[PDB]
Amino acid sequence: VRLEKILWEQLVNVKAFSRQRVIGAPSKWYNENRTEWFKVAQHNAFNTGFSGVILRALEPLLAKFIYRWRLDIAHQRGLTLEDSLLFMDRELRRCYFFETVARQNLHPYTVLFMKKRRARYYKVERGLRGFYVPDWVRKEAEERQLSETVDNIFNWENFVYREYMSDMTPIGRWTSLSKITPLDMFQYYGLFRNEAWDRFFYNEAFYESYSEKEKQEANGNPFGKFNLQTADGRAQFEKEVNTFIERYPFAVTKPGQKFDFTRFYALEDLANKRDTSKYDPALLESVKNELKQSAALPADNGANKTKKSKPILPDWLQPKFGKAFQA
Amino acid sequence: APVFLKALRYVIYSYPLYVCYLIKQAQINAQG
Amino acid sequence: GVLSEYNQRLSKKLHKGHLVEDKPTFFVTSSRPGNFGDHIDFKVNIDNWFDENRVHNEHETDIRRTQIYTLNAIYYGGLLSFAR
Amino acid sequence: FIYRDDIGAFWGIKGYEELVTEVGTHKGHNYWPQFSFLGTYDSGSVRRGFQVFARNCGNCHGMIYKKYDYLLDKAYRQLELAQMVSDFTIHPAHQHFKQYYYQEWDERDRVICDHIYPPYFSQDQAKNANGGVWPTDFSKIKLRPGGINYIYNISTGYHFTPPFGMDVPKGKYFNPYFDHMIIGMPRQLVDGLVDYDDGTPASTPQMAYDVSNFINFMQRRVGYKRPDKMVRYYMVFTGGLLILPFKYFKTKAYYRNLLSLRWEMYAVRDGVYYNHFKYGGYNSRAYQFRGYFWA
Amino acid sequence: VYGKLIFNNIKEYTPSWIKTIPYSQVTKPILRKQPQIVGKINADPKVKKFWVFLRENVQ
Amino acid sequence: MEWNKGTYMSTSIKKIVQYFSVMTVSFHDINSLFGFFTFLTIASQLVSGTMLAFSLVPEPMLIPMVREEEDVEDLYTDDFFWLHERGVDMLFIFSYFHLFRKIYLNNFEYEQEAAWKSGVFTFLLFQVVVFLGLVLCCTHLSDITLAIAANLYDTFFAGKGKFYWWIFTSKELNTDTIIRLAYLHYVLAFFLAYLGLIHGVDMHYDWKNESSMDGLETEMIWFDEALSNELGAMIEIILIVMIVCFFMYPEPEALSYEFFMWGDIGFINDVRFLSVAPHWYFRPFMAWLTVCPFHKIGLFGLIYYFFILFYQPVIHGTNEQNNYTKRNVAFVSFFINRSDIMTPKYHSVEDNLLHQITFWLFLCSALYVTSYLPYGRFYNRINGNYGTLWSFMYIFFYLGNSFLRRPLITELYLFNAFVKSKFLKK
């Protein structure tokens, strides 16, 4: 049997309903980045429509019980959100796909530090429950803001998609487990998956996808299309950013301090074509240097190296010192 | 997106409510 | 006395009921391999229980070992009584 | 989770709204030596209960499951019990399982090894002789509302009169503790009915109390074995409480001792590469992943 | 909390940009014997002899 | 059978001995030990139950008399019967607490599958064994249980034929039915031990005390360090249960669900239908039957509960696709403007408040369903208890729907925050 040309395909999947199958250039499975999909979906859900209005009304509760809750729990243990959002506990513990990716690409430190940070706390927690991390550890935990953590999260997810998840092709499958149990034995994978039935060929064009307009809109200002070239727009943006900073204590600034809007405006102007002398030369130089350093990839200097061991056999496994003229 | 998978999801959500409707009707009938 | 331990221990400096260091501490072993460098800035230890958790009886260790064996024997004896 | 008392169901247990169930257990506290803390059966009480059951009861009721020699170590001795039970007779028709052991072809005096059978050969004979209603078998009777109190209440609760709308048929009597409050048993206990061997005054409450104690003595989970099992539970609970500290020492303090570790991370900047991390590692379930996942 | 992800392009196990503390900061050991933490009952020499006897006769 | 790739661990005696003498256990707490308590109790059931095998003659007309006479003449027989009866209850308690603990930890991931299914199957078998045991009591409760089981079995065949006769001969407890059910009960009870051993071997692959991954590499040795702690925790839980039972179950009680067990089949032909109630562990199933008067729908509800409990890893957990699976949606498609949704990732446990709320609602609903008997004399005639209905609906929804256990908003809001923070800090 051919799944295409089946009765349902012949009747419903027809040009009249625009349900016809269109064959185009061959393309990879998983053609849509998950991170981009989540960004666009988040923009559509929060910054558009009645759903956006509702999710904006509930923002205080979400910040209180999701962001601040997680942050407080992490700080109690001397950890940051990076310790949970960058690599899920499951991925660090047992997941084999993450293990292979880390072994092939990642440096040992990237995961070693993640594990040791939890080891610190848990060595004491198992011995005595209710451990509260002292202030000296808590300070260094709070030093890192959320901007760098989200930078790392986006980098890691994009890398994983582009390298590995972009080089996969799932197939119809039976129970991977070798259990003799009939319940597990007859598990059938391949049906009830939307991807399996939407496209029967790797040539078929992708019918559903975010429009370029939606992507461009999602790439816009997260705080709702404020005019940074006007006084009223700047005031609205400043109040929005201030309330955001208050809501998220350790996202972009420490709770005590306040956000510096002049530097942000200088950054945005330098990024775009707009420029002028209204910005102090010192501010412009500092902004440019910080922008250069932020994206700079750290590199090893090849200095302060320790001696490489060159072991030799012990004395008792070597011939004795004395040696004369044999013959 | 597939028609039958979407229908399967709808019936999964709805069938519990259908059973609740049947239970309520049975209670009304038993009341007399 | 029997209850003097609780009274004496009440005077302790501990963070929220946990005996932890008041500042970062780093320990190095002078007998480490040559290829090891200086200690990494990472604070591996939050607590110094290795030194704190000590009864300074390096001499007379076998007596403490016998005490531990006796406690284990009491526990096993109770369990074996139930099994009997 | 919260239940209602005015409904008539104890603790939310429905099905007993047509009789009194909380008389002496929940809304009242009738003292029974057996169920008291560190309590035990009163030998005199069970003796009197057997005396009553052998002179008024038994002629209608019986315990097919039980036998007289249950009373050997608490209430009666062997010779005394044999003398008491020799006054009854069992036909071979009584035997639930006659087997080849019982080789009698006529009546004979009972022995302490005989099961407690009523004078009737079967349930139907008892129904015929008792107006079509069968005197319930007291064996396993513990499973009635109020437990041991049940026998005591019905034996005593005959003084009340029916309300309007309830009709008591001829041959039936009103007893609020029975199912639907209509019972075919005429009031049996009357003062002076039984002359005790120990001289105890014979009044219907005392006779009911003795009979209830005896009837409870014959049960399996409750009765002659319950008090010793309660003492055993107390002893085992004491043992567990006393073993808890040693469990603590052996498990939790021990784990805390094992966790007293020192860690030290150094800077190893020798030319050696970390090949083992890059090319290494094994997974037990690799056979379950090979050819199935991530490809 | 440390910083950006570093991939296997860094050959050395310890990248140069990490910080190594000087020898001044590392705490020094107390290479002296300290008083034994022992209770009154076990400090009794008779109890110590009993422990030794149990060790070397039954244990 | 080329489709079968083998077995995880060979159960040879020497290999088992070596595996258990070398096994190590990470530091844990009491909550993560219920599984052991589930096994040890079974290890007693095989013993105590065996002692009951030598006592019970499968003839229905002699089981009560034989039990009563063996209580007196024989010693420890009633003690072992009590031990067996209470072991069933303790085993149910331990198994359900273990199930709740493993549900709370989100153990549906692919690396958990072998651990999960291998466990659930055992649980399923356990249920069957329990059923058989009840029938051996030859009380009116056993009669009702057998009748209900036979009716459910016959519902499959639409009432045509007598396909139930080979085991439920006449749908009544007679010599044939009792003998067959007793022997099957013994056989399956002993098979439960092997199933539990297989599950225990499989689960060690990814056994953890808590969801959060402690970076501890050292571990205890199972034989004495972990075994002693497990035995002590079992002792502690037994003490707690005894303390609870002392207050909750005074021996002289006005009413109890056990009174319905008074009637013995054959001796008493009259069944008190007004007061019908099973043991608490099978209470929720009869409550569901009374709540849903429809036979087919009730049978489907029971089957769905058990099987969906079995297939949790497939429905909810991650698979070959690293969270790139396309879940179907009903309403959020309009809001997001997408027909499907990528499966959310940040489904943590300890720091996730939504997961805790949903899980504790589910657990409370289960407890409420097990709380009481609907009393179907007029339960439906009167407006039925809405709490039982709502709890059953939520039990069904929680087991089968990924939005309760893997909500989308958890990651959507986090991504919103990430985008805002990165935009502010570039």
Ligand SMILES: CCCCCCCCCCCCCCCCCC(=O)OC[C@H](COP(=O)([O-])OCC(O)COP(=O)([O-])OC[C@@H](COC(=O)CCCCCCCCCCCCCCCCC)OC(=O)CCCCCCCCCCCCCCCCC)OC(=O)CCCCCCCCCCCCCCCCC
């Ligand atoms: C229309 C009718 C409908 C009827 C419905 C009701 C009845 C249904 C069941 C019928 C019988 C089939 C049972 C299949 C297994 C259980 C069910 C299941 O899905 O498996 C769960 C479970 C899933 O395992 P898993 O999770 O994949 O774990 C890895 C595997 O176990 C990998 O395992 P392994 O490769 O390591 O092999 C293990 C094997 C090691 O093998 C050997 O060393 C020798 C094997 C050959 C033995 C040759 C002698 C045969 C006679 C003695 C048999 C003794 C063992 C028990 C065999 C099972 C049946 C009694 O055994 C052991 O290591 C020791 C076993 C423990 C001892 C005690 C067992 C008592 C069993 C009593 C209950 C039986 C099941 C009833 C289920 C009812 C429904 C819930 O499977 C088992 O537990 C397998 C047990 C061993 C089976 C051996 C081969 C059996 C061959 C059967 C052929 C067909 C017979 C048809 C007639 C039957 C008449 C009664």
Ligand SMILES: CCCCCCCCCCCCCCCCCC(=O)OC[C@H](COP(=O)([O-])OCC(O)COP(=O)([O-])OC[C@@H](COC(=O)CCCCCCCCCCCCCCCCC)OC(=O)CCCCCCCCCCCCCCCCC)OC(=O)CCCCCCCCCCCCCCCCC
């Ligand atoms: C006084 C107190 C009384 C309390 C009573 C108890 C019951 C009430 C609720 C109790 C508390 C909640 C318990 C359950 C939820 C626990 C939390 C949880 O899991 O939340 C996470 C979960 C997150 O879902 P997700 O991860 O976004 O879902 C992923 C996908 O979307 C996948 O999901 P999806 O998109 O497919 O949709 C998921 C969900 C819907 O959830 C969503 O909305 C999804 C999105 C949630 C995120 C946030 C969205 C925010 C914007 C939504 C706006 C919606 C419009 C409402 C606008 C309100 C403001 C104007 O839909 C369902 O699963 C059920 C749909 C069933 C359809 C039935 C159609 C049957 C038709 C055929 C019938 C045939 C038989 C009859 C025939 C008759 C013929 C005559 O959210 C929910 O469960 C939503 C509920 C939130 C908490 C409850 C809020 C209150 C709602 C009820 C108010 C009642 C007031 C009564 C007043 C009475 C005065 C007298």
Ligand SMILES: CCCCCCCCCCCCCCCCCC(=O)OC[C@H](COP(=O)([O-])OCC[N+](C)(C)C)OC(=O)CCCCCCCCCCCCCCCCC
């Ligand atoms: C459990 C009872 C087992 C009874 C076994 C009796 C044998 C029955 C078959 C007789 C011969 C007739 C064969 C007809 C053709 C079949 C072809 C086919 O489908 O091939 C299958 C294929 C054939 O094997 P193959 O694929 O290796 O074949 C290779 C090709 N040959 C054979 C030529 C070398 O294998 C299977 O898929 C086997 C499926 C077995 C399923 C068993 C399910 C039993 C369920 C019991 C109850 C479970 C209860 C669980 C607990 C519940 C608790 C509440």
Ligand SMILES: CCCCCCCCCCCCCCCCCC(=O)OC[C@H](COP(=O)([O-])OCC[N+](C)(C)C)OC(=O)CCCCCCCCCCCCCCCCC
């Ligand atoms: C100021 C005052 C301070 C003092 C406060 C003291 C408070 C102490 C609180 C202690 C804990 C209390 C326990 C709360 C929970 C009680 C639950 C309950 O009612 O249990 C009664 C029973 C007690 O037995 P019982 O037989 O007495 O039942 C209650 C009896 N009546 C009805 C008369 C009230 O609890 C148990 O024994 C059960 C324990 C294990 C339960 C495990 C979960 C099973 C869930 C199965 C779900 C199946 C679903 C599938 C069905 C198919 C279709 C979907």
Ligand SMILES: COC1=C(OC)C(=O)C(C/C=C(\C)CC/C=C(\C)CC/C=C(/C)CC/C=C(/C)CC/C=C(/C)CC/C=C(\C)CC/C=C(\C)CCC=C(C)C)=C(C)C1=O
């Ligand atoms: C991997 O993760 C896992 C765990 O960790 C969490 C588990 O805990 C578990 C749970 C583990 C279990 C249930 C196993 C624990 C089992 C328990 C408690 C019950 C069984 C315990 C035993 C010790 C069985 C012993 C069996 C026997 C036959 C030996 C009997 C015992 C004793 C002391 C007697 C030994 C001596 C003799 C037999 C000989 C006596 C006679 C003579 C010397 C005389 C001989 C001479 C003549 C002439 C006769 C599993 C399965 C798991 O997978």
Ligand SMILES: CCCCCCCC/C=C/CCCCCCCC(=O)OC[C@H](COP(=O)(O)OCCN)OC(=O)CCCCCCC/C=C/CCCCCCCC
């Ligand atoms: C012993 C046997 C007893 C009798 C068993 C009878 C089984 C009857 C099964 C009836 C199934 C009815 C639904 C079938 C729908 C098929 C539809 C189909 O193939 O059309 C394609 C269409 C997709 O196209 P679109 O995405 O809409 O187009 C995109 C355009 N851009 O497919 C779907 O959507 C279907 C998705 C769900 C499929 C579900 C299949 C379930 C099969 C279960 C197993 C059946 C086994 C039967 C034999 C059992 C023997 C023991």
Ligand SMILES: CCCCCCCC/C=C\CCCCCCCC(=O)OC[C@H](COP(=O)(O)OCCN)OC(=O)CCCCCCC/C=C\CCCCCCCC
């Ligand atoms: C509350 C329910 C439980 C909770 C469910 C929650 C999740 C729901 C998810 C979606 C499930 C969708 C299921 C849709 C169909 C469900 C059908 C069902 O359950 O049965 C109901 C419905 C009607 O039931 P009634 O009792 O009449 O109810 C009153 C009606 N006024 O039942 C049916 O009609 C089902 C009929 C199925 C017949 C199939 C054919 C059987 C033929 C004989 C087979 C013999 C096989 C023999 C094999 C031998 C091998 C050797």
Ligand code: HEC
């Ligand atoms: C024949 C005159 C009897 C004598 C002597 C005793 N009882 Fe009886 N009893 C008898 C009958 C016919 C019935 C059945 C009544 C009915 O409506 O079914 C009973 C019943 C009881 C009961 C209740 C049984 C039940 O299942 O609830 C009890 C508790 C009871 N009888 C006790 C009892 C006692 C203590 C007696 C000696 C004092 C006694 N009965 C004598 C007939 C006869």
Ligand code: HEM
């Ligand atoms: C008779 C029934 C059962 C027995 C005897 C049993 C036994 C055990 C034992 C001894 C353990 C190891 C100790 C521990 O629990 O920490 C364990 C772990 C486990 N069991 Fe069970 N169990 C049973 C039911 C179940 C059920 C119902 C499930 C799931 C629904 C399950 C899944 C698991 C899982 C997931 C683990 C831990 C694996 C992990 O953390 O990844 N088991 N079980």
Ligand code: HEM
């Ligand atoms: C996990 C294993 C087992 C479980 C869950 C189990 C369950 C049960 C249950 C629920 C009952 C009746 C409960 C009650 O009376 O209130 C029972 C009774 C009984 N069990 Fe088991 N059982 C198990 C193992 C065994 C084994 C292995 C045997 C025999 C080898 C056995 C023999 C019996 C007997 C004979 C009875 C009835 C005793 C009597 O009526 O006097 N059981 N069991």
